[PDB]
C-alpha cells in the first residue's frame, strides 16, 4: 500500500603490510636493484608502454564517471 510519507520517493536526504615493511626496514640488502619496492607498486610491465597505461587509466575513469552519472540521473525514469 502507498503509505504517506513512508516510501522511497517521499523520503530524502594489514598484517602482510606490517610484515613487508618490517622486512624492508630490517633488511635493506634484500631490496630489488631499483626495479621494485616492497610498499610501492612495481614498474610498468615489459609488454606495455607508459603512454598506453596513461590512456587506459583515463579511459577507465571516464567510463566509471559516465556510468555513475547515467545511473544517478536516470533514477526518476
Amino acid at each position: 500500500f502507498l503509505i504517506s510519507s513512508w516510501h522511497r520517493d517521499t523520503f530524502g536526504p594489514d598484517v602482510l603490510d606490517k610484515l613487508l615493511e618490517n622486512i624492508g626496514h630490517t633488511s635493506p640488502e634484500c631490496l630489488l636493484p631499483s626495479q621494485l619496492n616492497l610498499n610501492e607498486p612495481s614498474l610498468t610491465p615489459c609488454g606495455m608502454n607508459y603512454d598506453q597505461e596513461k590512456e587506459i587509466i583515463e579511459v577507465i575513469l571516464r567510463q566509471n564517471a559516465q556510468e555513475d552519472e547515467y545511473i544517478q540521473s536516470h533514477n526518476f525514469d
Partner: protein
C-alpha cells in the same frame, strides 16, 4: 573440483599485487 570460498582474513588485493603480481604480469606479457 570445487574451490573453497576465500578466507575472511585474507590480505588486501593491492598487497598481493605488490608482492607477486610483478612476476605474474611480466610472465603473462612476455608470452603475450
Amino acid at each position: 573440483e570445487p574451490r573453497p570460498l576465500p578466507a575472511p582474513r585474507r590480505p588486501k588485493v593491492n598487497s598481493i599485487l605488490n608482492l607477486f603480481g610483478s612476476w605474474l604480469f611480466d610472465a603473462a606479457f612476455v608470452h603475450c
